[PDB]
């Protein structure tokens, strides 16, 4: 069948933090399985950003390589879902060439808080029936909807419009009133008689429809540092924003909270491997937490007692004993086997892969004997396999095939120390 | 060969087959970036602040008032003043003042009429040396722009037609460097050589375009202003700054208008200055030369009828 | 009777690769000894195997390998032979570690562009175009006057038509100086004229001119086609972040600055992939995802490495392939932390190792032979025995590296093939790694 | 440097340390305009109403008066410059190209203000020469190579407007620049004056 | 109606077409004052 | 008497490698001398070179200092000739500010491949007898007019295009200019005034040097070759207009597709005999300075059929990697190591030693006494080959500052106690140990 | 032809008529303002804002590329004293790189 290019990456059979009401998670839901008291420390933090009367507050998501700190963040990412923003950024991500890393964590934070306000609008809508101009200029058009009909005679800026876009009888048009600008959608099913085909639009014609529309802080940040500040948006080409412009965006910004003529809408900003920003990074984000208008940080890291980088100095998580203070702590767990067959279950639900309970029980032992991800990455190239000998399934012989082929590191090491002297430095 | 007249036409020529058609990027036009009305009524800095912009222009030592209180009216007959260059260079307090808060429009215009100015200096600085300015003593006006005395500097240069002859690289042209040259006569098969000369590039060395183009992308507004403001954009900002971009410098348009008409007019500054080989657009047209280059019998055709032609034969 | 034979065009150049024409598996994707160029390596090979499958089977994303073993053991060998297993129809885009260190953009975001380049798309666009003779050229003023419409007269082999356009096309064709007898080309998608050239029916009304005259265009006036286009999503990227594209003053100096890079915002390549998306649902895209392959991956930095964990771990990433020459080195960045391959232990998790090891003296005899009927040449079994022995004394690339100077020296006193004295005599002209490594250590006082 | 390559400051200071030596005639005719006066023929050529062989310009200095002969071409560019008479203008005799300064300075009292700078009238003849010889170093010809200065195209004035930057000039220009000198001093037209760089603290 | 300039052997020679002006009007100096 | 650019150098007398035809070294020819191991093998390579069959071939020529790496390098620069692009890069010069060190290797790279074009066009050159030219009233903007050109043989008229006029007029041609139009470019140029058409002159509307009349037929052809490399092909379509990128090196780090697609062209301009590609040599000289991010681009770059013959210098043991704690022969990774063939080169004896100082004053047009070439060989085995040859230059001048014919042991006695080498001076920083700084 | 302009403003609170000098007239000519718009003038700084046609000719054509805004029912005529807070570093600047103007 055809492809998104949205395929099947690691993370992507999560499709929720899976959770009762009661904040408790069953043991396998929503794609994702076990960690019981990760998912409902992580429960508590999704309640947190969702309610957003708090700012300023931050959780570290932390334990052994490959035991879901990523995964769960991804789960969490998705139960929050859209019109919430939630950015992710890896922690090497902010080492900008052009911009200060302080102040591409000053920009992270920002894509990740919303303003949103609601703006009543004047939209006409329908299958023109019938358009006629003179020779300055007058005109009349009419306009149709499955339900009424109607005819306006034209001014000037509307003719100079309606003529510049070429529009014909029975093309169906929506047009915002205040602008002319005309969304031609498509034409009427009977007049695309001698390419797209359409229904005419349903009830009346001058709607007025309420437009939801959500602004990350930074990009009201963007449009107020250049002639046309927006195109740097897309583009990258705008960095180290004048800090006087942002003291008077937030200025402003508090005002439109106060007078309830804008809402914002607090989010995350998941700074995935933090291990590795630096102290200089880290000593920025012990204060830019302490503002109304912070996110709620979420971080990922799967590092021990380790030196914190740009210095000598030794701390947990890599993180200096400054920044811990700040967070709460949710401590992912190592997987028992029943949770890493379960977790290979559904991962082959995801590749849509079928194989023998053997087979799922030599793969959890290769799981457990290698560290989980090693183990799923098998089940890709073990249907591969199969699909090479005409198989239906994956039968415990074409892992002990694929488990020879593709080494884990434990035995690629062991296979390099036997040629130790051909290898370069070491 | 993964019925046969199929084959016969490939081997004779394969646009008997499949012609080579026009290629061009790929056109791409991303939907427009919506900002709300809102954003554009309330949100502009540049808008909202603006009666607090205007004391950053007040408070300002650019102000005309300022440099002529600092300029002229101090209270010490040595005292230190800033502005001091401004009787130096060429410039009115007001065209200092202007230059700062007109932006790249006015640096513009004032860049073009400088360059004018540079040939009137280097007349007057190269030939005229009695006494001194005034009395033996005093400067001038004009006396700190030295960028001029430089042998090399672009007014002596173009006064000095060997020192011309040595800075070759002009902007507009494809020069590659110098070589020799072979002139061949028709009468006699004699052929010469011209030692060191000027050379273009082959004019069919620029050949490559990107797989995609953009529409530039664009913002829409919910509102009758915001159209105003992004159609004046679209149409070029304002004839002044549409011409200076195109022609050079609006002088350079109303020149290129009635330039039209005269004998030996000089070259136009803008966009229109430059002729990229190709023209601007990254479409490739297919060349005549790939009906030889796509057969090796036309090829083969080619050398004999040139063999032929040599010789004389019908 | 007479002939007559030419073809005077030089070959394409022998590079270091240029022998390996595929991975060279039967059907049951098993390695023969040797095929399509490559020798030994089976359990490597067959590994390299599976991976063509993943590829063209399209289902994953950020699926990653690291082609392991020391120098002279084929790993950019079989990254090679993937590149020519899956044809030029997918992108594979060779990329060396070192190459993210740029001056003009972050590490973590050259990283980026590799991955958004080596993800391919098939496009059927859609171009209506008009071309002809301008037999006729108006522009039409209106009341705020200024230009507002244009009406062009264009003409063909087929007839001709007099058609009404927007001003931005006039304002194109006085750009490219257009004039009456010109033949001209105009998408209307991109609004971009080309002037093709003048008719070539004026070509006689002048004794000298500059102009270069072309035939009259064939068909209609007005004509639309499809253009198969083959494009990356880097592609799509890159050409927003700095639009060159329309008509309009800005494009077209945009076109003029020095085309420095950008480190593009995440917003624009989300929106890239929702327009995709849509070319995709609407049938006039297909997607083509690819293979990245980062050789001498052991010295991106441990900035890069640690972005991999998030770039493997997309929905959307090619398929990535690594190779390492290294063992327990030091990891770049790190000061003093060691790791197998040169790579962290956190990402050597998220790729399948594919082992790749020394060659046995009957392995290095075929390889060489290989290679040097790939170069060209002819050489006699005693002297290729003798390079198989240099090539235990030594190394693979150093045995194949005398084959070209050894008929050099054939050719030069006359012979048809390599003799075993041009072997033992280049033998002794150009030393090897193994060997000047004693006379460097011998003489160390001296350098 | 910050802007340029450690290893180009050494090869620009390797290129200053040799000067051309370069001689050339200046040749100019200046003064005050006393007249412009367009020279009809007495028969004009057939279907044309009237035909100019010259125009005549009256220049003038504190040395004395002399009318020149000017070819019918410099007419246009006697309205480009916008040249009346009691006017100080030059041309360059190697070129024809004619220059306006500003009135001269005999008029500055026929209005109490008036928007144009008055130029001294000039002294020494109305036709000027002296040959000059002029010292520029490699480096000088590398520079105004790689950042042309003669402004009036799109690429000079945003390349003029913009910061002046340094810039990594190619082993190509060096080159192109030394096949063009030895051109020169072959010709007898520039003598060379190899020097010294001369590094302190090396 | 075409206005003709011929660069010429023994001379140039520019040339106006009847009832075009011959925008080559002559150009005198008017006298000043005695003193200032 | 005159100078020219080009002056006596550190290499000035070595004109080519001085191998026979069977590619075996003469004993002293075309400035080189001795060294018979290394410029056996450096025929070898030139003959590859030369060759070109073959691509991403690399060459390490090690040795001692002064033992003449560098020498057979420009050896084999000479012998190569002008015609095929010959790269010198110190490999300082790659740590570029414009852009990164991959960059500056991918450009040193594609500045070593040549394509050569034959450019072939029609030029009309003559002699202008007369233009006119006609102008509108008013009118729409289309001019028309006619050249007369001429030769010592011949004379034409020419109805001229509008497209031409504009050139005709821009360049300010004149009657009695003799001038060269390019009648495929259209493009004018002008050789100077014709010597009669001054006497019947205004006042001087042009000054500039005479040139007789063109002789024969006045419609010619001419042939030019331009040797145009990859990397200003990359720079001429990195962007529109881009050719002062050429020289200003203002272009840094450009687009890999844009090779990409040069890399497919030039091949077509191969397989359509439009231009023909020439391989050629990188001389990344002293290459122990490269980082080893710099070295581990060529590992890859090295592998592809646009790559030069490279060849590396260096003089330098067993050596950390520049940017490593990394101890390897020559200062260079295995991985590179493994993939070029290494020339070493030798010490000099007196038998050569003294014939390179013999060339060396033939070369800086110097005679010495046999007495001053015994001692001076002597000198340049007590100390270094350099010094010994620098000694040569101070020697003729001490020589001629007394007004002598001929250099004499006395100078080179005089020039030796005047201008350390390096070992006398070092023992004389041991006495003032106090007193120069940061011991 | 220039001296200066008067223009009258009228909401549903009464009418003026002002005396703006041809610097502003120059804002309301870019704005492209004309009798029957709502307008904003801010009297201290020239800021000036057209705000869409007044609803009373919403009329003038069944369908136009005009936004209609009711007259405001506010005052036509506002005083404030206020207070502005502008540090040195503003003035800076705002003055050291040549202002916008754009
Ligand atoms: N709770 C989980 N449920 C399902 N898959 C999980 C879970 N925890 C980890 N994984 C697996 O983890 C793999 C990615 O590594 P991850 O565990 O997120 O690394 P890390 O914990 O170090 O961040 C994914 O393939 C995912 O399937
Ligand atoms: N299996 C093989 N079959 C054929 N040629 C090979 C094989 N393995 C290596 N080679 C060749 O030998 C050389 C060394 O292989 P290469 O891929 O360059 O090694 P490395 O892993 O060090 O990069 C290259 O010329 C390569 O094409
Ligand atoms: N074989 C040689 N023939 C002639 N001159 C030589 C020879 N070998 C060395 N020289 C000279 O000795 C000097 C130093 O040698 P060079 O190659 O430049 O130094 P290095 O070996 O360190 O690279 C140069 O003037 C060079 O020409």
Same mark, same amino acid.
């Given at each position: 069948?055809?492809?998104?290019?949205?395929?099947?990456?690691?993370?992507?059979?999560?499709?929720?933090?899976?959770? @009762?009401?009661?904040?408790?998670?069953?043991?396998?839901?929503?794609?994702?399985?076990?960690?019981?008291?990760?998912?409902?420390? $992580?429960?508590?933090?999704?309640?947190?950003?969702?309610?957003?009367?708090?700012?300023?507050?931050?959780?570290?998501?932390?334990?052994?390589?490959?035991?879901? /700190?990523?995964?769960? $963040?991804?789960?969490?990412?998705?139960?929050?879902?859209?019109?919430?923003?939630?950015?992710?950024?890896?922690?090497?991500?902010?080492?900008?060439?052009?911009?200060?890393?302080?102040?591409?964590?000053?920009?992270?934070?920002?894509?990740?808080?919303?303003?949103?306000?609601?703006?009543?609008?004047?939209?006409?809508?329908?299958?023109?029936?019938?358009?006629?101009?003179?020779?300055?200029?007058?005109?009349?058009?009419?306009?149709?909807?499955?339900?009424?009909?109607?005819?306006?005679?034209?001014?000037?800026?509307?003719?100079?419009?309606?003529?510049?876009? /070429?529009?014909? $009888?029975?093309?169906?048009?929506?047009?915002?009133?205040?602008?002319? /600008?005309?969304?031609?959608?498509?034409?009427?099913?009977?007049?695309?008689?001698?390419?797209?085909?359409?229904?005419?639009?349903?009830?009346?014609?001058?709607?007025?429809?309420?437009?939801?529309?959500?602004? !990350?802080?930074?990009?009201?940040?963007?449009?107020?540092?250049?002639?046309?500040?927006?195109?740097?948006?897309?583009?990258?080409?705008?960095?180290?924003?004048?800090?006087?412009?942002?003291?008077?965006?937030?200025? /402003?910004? $508090?005002?439109?909270?106060?007078?309830?003529?804008?809402?914002?809408?607090?989010?995350?900003?998941?700074?995935?491997?933090?291990?590795?920003?630096?102290?200089?990074?880290?000593?920025?984000?012990?204060?830019?937490?302490?503002?109304?208008?912070?996110?709620?940080?979420?971080?990922?890291?799967?590092?021990?007692?380790?030196?914190?980088?740009?210095?000598?100095?030794?701390?947990?998580?890599?993180?200096?004993?400054?920044?811990? @203070?700040?967070?709460?702590?949710?401590?992912?767990?190592?997987?028992?086997?029943?949770?890493?067959?379960?977790?290979?279950?559904?991962?082959?639900?995801?590749? @849509?892969?079928?194989?023998?309970?053997?087979?799922?029980?030599?793969?959890?032992?290769?799981?457990?004997?290698? !560290?989980?991800?090693?183990?799923?990455?098998?089940?890709?190239?073990?249907?591969?396999?199969?699909?090479?000998?005409?198989?239906?399934?994956?039968?415990? @012989?074409?892992?002990?095939?694929?488990? !020879?082929?593709?080494?884990?590191?434990?035995?690629?090491?062991?296979?390099?120390?036997?040629?130790?002297?051909?290898?370069?430095?070491? | 060969?993964?019925?046969?007249?199929?084959?016969?036409?490939?081997?004779?020529?394969?646009?008997?087959?499949?012609?080579?058609?026009?290629?061009?990027?790929?056109?791409?036009?991303?939907?427009?970036?919506?900002?709300?009305? &809102?954003?554009?009524?309330?949100?502009?800095?540049?808008?909202?602040?603006?009666?607090?912009?205007?004391?950053?222009?007040?408070?300002?030592?650019?102000?005309? =008032?300022?440099?002529?209180?600092?300029?002229?009216?101090?209270?010490?007959?040595?005292?230190?003043?800033?502005?001091?260059?401004?009787?130096?260079?060429?410039?009115?307090?007001?065209?200092?003042?202007?230059?700062?808060?007109?932006?790249?429009?006015?640096?513009?215009?004032?860049?073009?009429?400088?360059?004018?100015?540079?040939?009137?200096?280097?007349?007057?600085?190269?030939?005229?040396?009695?006494?001194?300015?005034?009395?033996?003593?005093?400067?001038?006006?004009? =006396? &700190?722009?030295?960028?001029?005395?430089?042998?090399?500097?672009?007014?002596?240069?173009?006064?000095?037609?060997?020192?011309?002859?040595?800075?070759?690289?002009?902007?507009?042209?494809?020069?590659?460097?110098?070589?020799?040259?072979?002139?061949?006569?028709?009468?006699?098969?004699?052929?010469?050589?011209?030692?060191?000369?000027?050379?273009?590039?082959?004019?069919?060395?620029?050949?490559?375009?990107?797989?995609?183009?953009?529409?530039?992308?664009?913002?829409?507004?919910?509102?009758?202003?915001?159209?105003?403001?992004?159609?004046?954009?679209?149409?070029?900002?304002?004839?002044?700054?549409?011409?200076?971009?195109?022609?050079?410098?609006?002088?350079?348009?109303?020149?290129?208008?009635?330039?039209?008409?005269?004998? &030996?007019?000089?070259?136009?500054?803008?966009?229109?200055?430059?002729?990229?080989?190709?023209?601007?657009? &990254?479409?490739?047209?297919?060349?005549?030369?790939?009906?030889?280059? =796509?057969?090796?019998?036309?090829?083969?055709? =080619?050398?004999?009828?040139?063999?032929?032609?040599?010789?004389?034969?019908? | 009777?007479?002939?007559?034979?030419?073809?005077?065009?030089?070959?394409?150049?022998?590079?270091?690769?240029?022998?390996?024409?595929?991975?060279?598996?039967?059907?049951?994707? #098993?390695?023969?000894?040797?095929?399509?160029?490559?020798?030994?390596?089976?359990?490597?090979?067959?590994?390299?195997?599976?991976?063509?499958?993943?590829?063209?089977?399209?289902?994953?994303?950020?699926?990653?390998?690291?082609?392991?073993?020391?120098?002279?053991?084929?790993? +950019?060998?079989?990254? #090679?032979?993937?590149?020519?297993?899956?044809?030029?129809?997918?992108?594979?885009?060779?990329?060396?570690?070192?190459?993210?260190?740029?001056?003009?953009?972050?590490?973590?975001?050259?990283?980026?562009?590799?991955?958004?380049?080596?993800?391919?798309?098939?496009?059927?666009?859609?171009?209506?175009?008009?071309?002809?003779?301008?037999?006729?050229?108006?522009?039409?003023?209106?009341?705020?006057?200024?230009?507002?419409?244009?009406?062009?007269?264009?003409?063909?082999?087929?007839?001709?038509?007099?058609?009404?356009?927007?001003?931005?096309?006039?304002?194109?064709?006085?750009?490219?100086?257009?004039?009456?007898?010109?033949?001209?080309?105009?998408?209307?998608?991109?609004?971009?004229?080309?002037?093709?050239?003048?008719?070539?029916?004026?070509?006689?009304?002048?004794?000298?001119?500059?102009?270069?005259?072309?035939?009259?265009?064939?068909?209609?006036?007005?004509?639309?086609?499809?253009?198969?286009?083959?494009?990356?999503?880097?592609?799509?990227?890159?050409?927003?972040?700095?639009?060159?594209?329309?008509?309009?003053?800005?494009?077209?100096?945009?076109?003029?600055?020095?085309?420095?890079?950008?480190?593009?915002?995440?917003?624009?390549?989300?929106?890239?992939?929702?327009?995709?998306?849509?070319?995709?649902?609407?049938?006039?895209? %297909?997607?083509?995802?690819?293979?990245?392959?980062?050789?001498?991956?052991?010295?991106?930095?441990?900035?890069?490495?640690?972005?991999?964990?998030?770039? #493997?771990?997309?929905?959307?990433?090619?398929?990535?392939?690594?190779?390492?020459?290294?063992?327990?080195?030091?990891?770049?960045?790190?000061?003093?932390?060691?790791?197998?391959?040169?790579?962290?232990?956190?990402?050597?998790?998220?790729?399948?190792?594919?082992? +790749?090891?020394?060659?046995?003296?009957?392995?290095?005899?075929?390889?060489?032979?290989?290679?040097?009927? +790939?170069?060209?040449?002819?050489?006699? %079994?005693?002297?290729?025995?003798?390079?198989?022995?240099?090539?235990?004394?030594?190394?693979?690339?150093?045995?194949?590296?005398?084959?070209?100077?050894?008929?050099?020296?054939?050719?030069?006193?006359?012979?048809?093939?390599?003799?075993?004295?041009?072997?033992?005599?280049?033998?002794?002209?150009?030393?090897?790694?193994?060997?000047?490594?004693?006379?460097?250590?011998?003489?160390?006082?001296?350098? | 440097?910050?802007?340029?390559?450690?290893?180009?400051?050494?090869?620009?200071?390797?290129?200053?340390?040799?000067?051309?030596?370069?001689?050339?005639?200046?040749?100019?005719?200046?003064?005050?305009?006393?007249?412009?006066?367009?020279?009809?023929?007495?028969?004009?050529?057939?279907?044309?109403?009237?035909?100019?062989?010259?125009?005549?310009?009256?220049?003038?200095?504190?040395?004395?008066?002399?009318?020149?002969?000017?070819?019918?071409?410099?007419?246009?560019?006697?309205?480009?410059?916008?040249?009346?008479?009691?006017?100080?203008?030059?041309?360059?005799?190697?070129?024809?190209?004619?220059?306006?300064?500003?009135?001269?300075?005999?008029?500055?009292?026929?209005?109490?203000?008036?928007?144009?700078?008055?130029?001294?009238?000039?002294?020494?003849?109305?036709?000027?020469?002296?040959?000059?010889?002029?010292?520029?170093?490699?480096?000088?010809?590398?520079?105004?190579?790689?950042?042309?200065?003669?402004?009036?195209?799109?690429?000079?004035?945003?390349?003029?407007?913009?910061?002046?930057?340094?810039?990594?000039?190619?082993?190509?220009?060096?080159?192109?620049?030394?096949?063009?000198?030895?051109?020169?001093?072959?010709?007898?037209?520039?003598?060379?004056?190899?020097?010294?760089?001369?590094?302190?603290?090396? | 109606?075409?206005?003709?300039?011929?660069?010429?052997?023994?001379?140039?020679?520019?040339?106006?077409?009847?009832?075009?002006?011959?925008?080559?009007?002559?150009?005198?100096?008017?006298?000043?004052?005695?003193?200032?």
């Amino acid at each position: 069948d055809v492809t998104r290019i949205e395929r099947i990456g690691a993370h992507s059979h999560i499709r929720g933090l899976g959770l @009762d009401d009661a904040l408790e998670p069953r043991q396998a839901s929503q794609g994702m399985v076990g960690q019981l008291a990760a998912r409902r420390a $992580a429960g508590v933090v999704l309640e947190m950003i969702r309610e957003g009367k708090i700012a300023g507050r931050a959780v570290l998501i932390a334990g052994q390589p490959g035991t879901g /700190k990523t995964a769960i $963040a991804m789960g969490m990412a998705q139960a929050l879902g859209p019109d919430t923003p939630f950015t992710a950024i890896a922690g090497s991500e902010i080492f900008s060439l052009e911009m200060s890393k302080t102040e591409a964590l000053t920009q992270a934070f920002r894509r990740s808080i919303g303003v949103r306000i609601k703006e009543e609008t004047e939209i006409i809508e329908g299958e023109v029936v019938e358009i006629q101009i003179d020779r300055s200029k007058v005109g009349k058009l009419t306009l149709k909807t499955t339900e009424m009909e109607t005819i306006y005679d034209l001014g000037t800026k509307m003719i100079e419009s309606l003529t510049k876009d /070429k529009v014909q $009888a029975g093309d169906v048009i929506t047009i915002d009133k205040a602008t002319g /600008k005309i969304s031609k959608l498509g034409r009427s099913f009977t007049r695309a008689r001698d390419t797209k085909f359409v229904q005419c639009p349903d009830g009346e014609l001058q709607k007025r429809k309420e437009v939801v529309h959500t602004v !990350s802080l930074h990009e009201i940040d963007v449009i107020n540092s250049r002639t046309q500040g927006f195109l740097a948006l897309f583009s990258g080409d705008t960095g180290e924003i004048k800090s006087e412009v942002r003291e008077q965006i937030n200025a /402003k910004v $508090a005002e439109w909270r106060e007078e309830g003529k804008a809402e914002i809408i607090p989010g995350v900003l998941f700074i995935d491997e933090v291990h590795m920003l630096d102290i200089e990074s880290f000593s920025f984000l012990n204060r830019a937490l302490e503002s109304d208008m912070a996110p709620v940080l979420i971080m990922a890291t799967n590092r021990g007692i380790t030196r914190i980088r740009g210095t000598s100095y030794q701390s947990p998580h890599g993180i200096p004993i400054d920044l811990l @203070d700040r967070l709460l702590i949710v401590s992912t767990t190592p997987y028992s086997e029943k949770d890493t067959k379960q977790i290979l279950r559904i991962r082959c639900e995801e590749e @849509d892969v079928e194989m023998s309970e053997d087979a799922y029980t030599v793969l959890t032992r290769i799981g457990l004997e290698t !560290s989980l991800r090693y183990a799923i990455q098998l089940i890709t190239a073990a249907s591969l396999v199969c699909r090479k000998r005409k198989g239906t399934e994956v039968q415990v @012989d074409d892992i002990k095939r694929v488990y !020879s082929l593709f080494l884990d590191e434990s035995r690629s090491t062991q296979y390099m120390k036997e040629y130790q002297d051909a290898f370069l430095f070491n | 060969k993964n019925l046969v007249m199929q084959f016969r036409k490939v081997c004779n020529h394969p646009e008997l087959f499949e012609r080579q058609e026009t290629w061009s990027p790929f056109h791409i036009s991303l939907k427009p970036y919506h900002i709300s009305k &809102f954003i554009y009524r309330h949100g502009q800095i540049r808008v909202f602040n603006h009666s607090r912009d205007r004391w950053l222009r007040v408070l300002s030592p650019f102000a005309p =008032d300022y440099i002529q209180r600092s300029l002229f009216h101090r209270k010490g007959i040595n005292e230190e003043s800033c502005f001091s260059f401004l009787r130096f260079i060429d410039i009115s307090p007001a065209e200092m003042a202007n230059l700062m808060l007109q932006g790249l429009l006015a640096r513009w215009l004032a860049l073009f009429l400088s360059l004018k100015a540079s040939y009137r200096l280097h007349q007057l600085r190269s030939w005229g040396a009695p006494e001194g300015e005034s009395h033996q003593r005093y400067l001038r006006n004009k =006396d &700190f722009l030295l960028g001029v005395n430089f042998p090399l500097s672009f007014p002596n240069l173009c006064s000095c037609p060997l020192l011309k002859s040595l800075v070759f690289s002009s902007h507009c042209k494809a020069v590659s460097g110098y070589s020799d040259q072979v002139v061949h006569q028709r009468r006699s098969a004699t052929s010469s050589l011209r030692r060191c000369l000027l050379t273009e590039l082959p004019s069919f060395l620029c050949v490559a375009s990107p797989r995609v183009t953009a529409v530039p992308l664009d913002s829409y507004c919910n509102d009758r202003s915001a159209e105003y403001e992004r159609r004046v954009l679209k149409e070029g900002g304002s004839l002044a700054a549409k011409q200076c971009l195109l022609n050079g410098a609006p002088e350079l348009a109303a020149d290129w208008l009635n330039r039209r008409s005269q004998f &030996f007019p000089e070259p136009a500054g803008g966009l229109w200055s430059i002729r990229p080989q190709n023209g601007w657009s &990254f479409i490739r047209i297919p060349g005549k030369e790939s009906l030889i280059t =796509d057969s090796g019998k036309l090829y083969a055709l =080619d050398v004999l009828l040139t063999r032929l032609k040599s010789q004389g034969h019908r | 009777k007479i002939e007559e034979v030419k073809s005077t065009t030089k070959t394409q150049r022998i590079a270091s690769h240029s022998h390996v024409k595929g991975l060279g598996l039967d059907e049951s994707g #098993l390695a023969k000894q040797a095929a399509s160029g490559l020798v030994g390596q089976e359990n490597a090979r067959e590994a390299c195997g599976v991976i063509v499958e993943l590829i063209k089977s399209k289902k994953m994303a950020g699926r990653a390998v690291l082609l392991a073993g020391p120098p002279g053991t084929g790993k +950019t060998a079989l990254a #090679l032979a993937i590149a020519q297993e899956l044809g030029s129809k997918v992108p594979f885009c060779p990329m060396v570690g070192s190459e993210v260190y740029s001056t003009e953009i972050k590490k973590t975001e050259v990283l980026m562009e590799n991955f958004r380049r080596a993800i391919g798309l098939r496009i059927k666009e859609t171009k209506e175009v008009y071309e002809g003779e301008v037999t006729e050229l108006t522009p039409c003023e209106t009341e705020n006057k200024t230009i507002s419409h244009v009406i062009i007269g264009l003409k063909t082999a087929k007839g001709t038509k007099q058609l009404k356009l927007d001003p931005s096309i006039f304002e194109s064709l006085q750009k490219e100086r257009v004039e009456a007898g010109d033949v001209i080309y105009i998408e209307a998608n991109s609004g971009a004229v080309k002037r093709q050239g003048r008719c070539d029916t004026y070509a006689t009304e002048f004794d000298l001119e500059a102009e270069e005259y072309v035939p009259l265009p064939k068909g209609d006036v007005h004509k639309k086609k499809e253009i198969i286009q083959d494009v990356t999503l880097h592609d799509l990227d890159v050409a927003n972040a700095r639009p060159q594209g329309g008509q309009d003053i800005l494009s077209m100096m945009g076109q003029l600055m020095k085309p420095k890079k950008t480190e593009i915002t995440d917003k624009l390549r989300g929106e890239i992939n929702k327009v995709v998306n849509k070319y995709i649902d609407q049938g006039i895209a %297909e997607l083509v995802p690819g293979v990245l392959f980062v050789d001498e991956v052991h010295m991106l930095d441990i900035e890069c490495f640690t972005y991999l964990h998030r770039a #493997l771990e997309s929905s959307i990433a090619p398929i990535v392939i690594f190779a390492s020459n290294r063992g327990n080195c030091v990891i770049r960045g790190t000061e003093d932390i060691t790791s197998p391959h040169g790579i962290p232990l956190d990402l050597l998790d998220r790729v399948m190792i594919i082992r +790749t090891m020394l060659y046995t003296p009957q392995e290095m005899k075929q390889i060489i032979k290989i290679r040097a009927q +790939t170069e060209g040449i002819n050489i006699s %079994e005693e002297a290729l025995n003798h390079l198989g022995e240099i090539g235990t004394k030594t190394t693979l690339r150093y045995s194949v590296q005398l084959l070209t100077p050894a008929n050099l020296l054939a050719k030069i006193n006359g012979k048809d093939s390599i003799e075993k004295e041009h072997v033992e005599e280049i033998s002794e002209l150009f030393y090897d790694a193994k060997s000047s490594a004693k006379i460097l250590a011998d003489q160390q006082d001296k350098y | 440097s910050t802007e340029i390559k450690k290893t180009e400051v050494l090869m620009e200071n390797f290129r200053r340390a040799i000067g051309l030596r370069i001689k050339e005639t200046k040749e100019v005719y200046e003064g005050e305009v006393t007249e412009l006066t367009p020279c009809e023929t007495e028969n004009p050529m057939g279907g044309y109403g009237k035909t100019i062989s010259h125009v005549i310009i009256g220049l003038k200095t504190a040395k004395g008066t002399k009318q020149l002969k000017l070819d019918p071409s410099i007419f246009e560019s006697l309205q480009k410059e916008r040249v009346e008479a009691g006017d100080v203008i030059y041309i360059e005799a190697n070129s024809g190209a004619v220059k306006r300064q500003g009135r001269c300075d005999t008029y500055a009292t026929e209005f109490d203000l008036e928007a144009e700078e008055y130029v001294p009238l000039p002294k020494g003849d109305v036709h000027k020469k002296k040959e000059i010889i002029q010292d520029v170093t490699l480096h000088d010809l590398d520079v105004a190579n790689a950042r042309p200065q003669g402004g009036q195209d799109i690429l000079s004035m945003m390349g003029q407007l913009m910061k002046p930057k340094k810039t990594e000039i190619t082993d190509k220009l060096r080159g192109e620049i030394n096949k063009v000198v030895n051109k020169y001093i072959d010709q007898g037209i520039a003598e060379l004056v190899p020097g010294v760089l001369f590094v302190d603290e090396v | 109606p075409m206005v003709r300039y011929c660069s010429g052997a023994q001379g140039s020679t520019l040339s106006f077409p009847p009832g075009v002006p011959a925008p080559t009007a002559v150009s005198q100096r008017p006298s000043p004052s005695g003193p200032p």
